[PDB]
Design a protein around this ligand. Sequence first.
Ligand SMILES: O=C(O)C(=O)Cc1ccc(O)cc1
Ligand SMILES: [Cl-]
Length: 360
Amino acid sequence: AETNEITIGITVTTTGPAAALGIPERNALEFVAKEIGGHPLKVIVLDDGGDPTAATTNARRFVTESKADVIMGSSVTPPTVAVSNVANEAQVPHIALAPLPITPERAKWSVAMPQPIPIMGKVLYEHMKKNNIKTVGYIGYSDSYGDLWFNDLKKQGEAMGLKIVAEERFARPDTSVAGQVLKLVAANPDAILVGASGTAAALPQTSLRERGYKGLIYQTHGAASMDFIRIAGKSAEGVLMASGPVMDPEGQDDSALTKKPGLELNTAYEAKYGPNSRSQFAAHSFDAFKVLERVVPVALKTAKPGTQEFREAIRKALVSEKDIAASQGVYSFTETDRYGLDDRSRILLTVKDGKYVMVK
Ligand SMILES: O=C(O)C(=O)Cc1ccc(O)cc1
Ligand SMILES: [Cl-]
């Protein structure tokens, strides 16, 4: 029944349009702890292609075939909702690697590593209101992720002095946004917020600049990898982008709790995969293990791996262990706050000379 190993199942997106998010998540697993408390970690990684059906199947294989103590994933919101559904039914701790709406139905067994949308929205809107932005347009996905961002722009953003003059949506698989851009450019808001991720985030970037949009463009943390710059090229110049601090540990003070783990991950990842290969996404899987390094020893005091008692002790340890330092933030979860993050979890980036720079 009980085991020596601690069993962790991970479903991420390493094929399909979101592969650029999952590949680094999987690769970061080379750099995480092999053991916690003397107990070897048995880590089982699967691709879900970003599909909720595959992520549901993967999560179930972990909780039932592997008897996992913890499950992690996925890379994008729709499959992450699916994993949460499974985790909460099976009563297994779930560490999400994409923001998701953490409803009362999902909250008991799920926490999230990515910064919550309102923290990222605030940093972007604050900048807007320092840069003479009065009117704003939105272009984002026609699904839960695009909704969370739009709703935040409407609730938080408007309350900061923004007037929404245009709202357009597109689906993840689309390779053109020409019609939506036509309306947006026509409305000529002072700024446009793009609610998308990966290669799709670069699409409105290029397409708006080539249509002659001159306003400020703002990107979510779903865009925070070099892939965006790769894909957007010269059109990325001057973008403002919400990011976790892992994108610039060098720019942090030594007093920042996030600095050490950011330097650790980035040194390791960039030694194998090359300079400036750091990402938002690699950091979420890395940080999930930093959380495990705090909560697993607590659980090990009172429960044996491979048992429900251990899963329950992990659940309780997630909310008893405070100020968990990781590359993307300092986490303090509660029964009700399943993200656990504050201002230490974000910085604002721009692109100059084809590289990300921290906006001071
Ligand atoms: O595309 C989606 O659904 C996402 O959830 C993307 C995403 C993933 C991780 C982040 O830290 C921020 C955004
Ligand atoms: Cl810690």
